[PDB]
Design a protein around this ligand. Sequence first.
Ligand SMILES: [Mg+2]
Lengths: 49, 339
Amino acid sequence: LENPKISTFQMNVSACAWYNADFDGDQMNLWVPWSVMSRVEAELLCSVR
Amino acid sequence: MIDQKIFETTLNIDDPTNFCTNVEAHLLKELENIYVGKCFKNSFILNITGVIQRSPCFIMRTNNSGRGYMHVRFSAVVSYLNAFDLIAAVKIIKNDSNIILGESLLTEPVTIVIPSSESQNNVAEVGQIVPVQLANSSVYYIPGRQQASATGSIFIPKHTFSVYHVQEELTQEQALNLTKLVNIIEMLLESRSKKDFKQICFFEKLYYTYSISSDEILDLKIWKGPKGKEMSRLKPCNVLSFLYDALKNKNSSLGFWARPPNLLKSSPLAYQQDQNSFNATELPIICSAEVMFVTLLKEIINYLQFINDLCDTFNNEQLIKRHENIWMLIEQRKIGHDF
Ligand SMILES: [Mg+2]
């Protein structure tokens, strides 16, 4: 999100069923895999599909 | 000595795809780059004979490096120094009040640290090459080091000897085992036979326990011993001939075996008797033919190596005169013909 005034993690409402989340003030963690091996298994194993 | 040793290691491969294009060559290269010239598992590695047995190039599992590892079982030519061995050349580099530090020249890189006694600091100086006697298990091979540390003493030939009582016969297969030592002695002899007669003769005269009035100490082709007034009524026996005869089982190896200092240490001669008539100051040791033969063969090999190394080191008489002070320090410890 290249708007500098947005500080929130935004996601589709139909994805909240995975995390049992809603938008009343919930917080969520996010980390981006930097290693190649961790990056491969993120995409092949741990994708939300 | 110098022999074969089988080692096991695990090599890390930083680029498995390249390494696996030629596993044998890369494996030999890495073993040589890691182990040649270093101490590892109570031994000093000289050469890599080969790779007996290896594993696949496994990919390391506990980190995301993508790197490989391979288990290798390899055979290497190594050199293990025994207790109380005898080196012929060491260059003393450090002469302090506390210890003396020298390095071997002829043999493989070895550091010899003689603890400084009051009778040693006033003789040995920087630049001298002397022979040294080792000690028991003082040759600790600290892993990863380029030399074998060992404490030693400036060599003066002894006046005593050992007597072994053998009550069990030397069998044929153990003779096959000692065939390797016999062959080693044969190679040492044929290597010594090339050298100048004067150098070997002078070194033998210096390191013979007694003194003899010239031209009476050496018969290279027959080894008849020193012709001094027939001191013993029994001729000393050649060890090689006795072993070759016991190969065909014509002689018995029982009784008392001794090598008195009058005998030439480098020759294959020795004394055997049916009764304990040797004038030893120590009790004879009851042992089998295997132990006694191994000890005698090892002593012969050690003294042949000592004479060969002495003759190789001092190729010119000028260096002999430069080291003549050590020669006279040896000489004053000799025993005269007052008997
Ligand atoms: Mg909530």
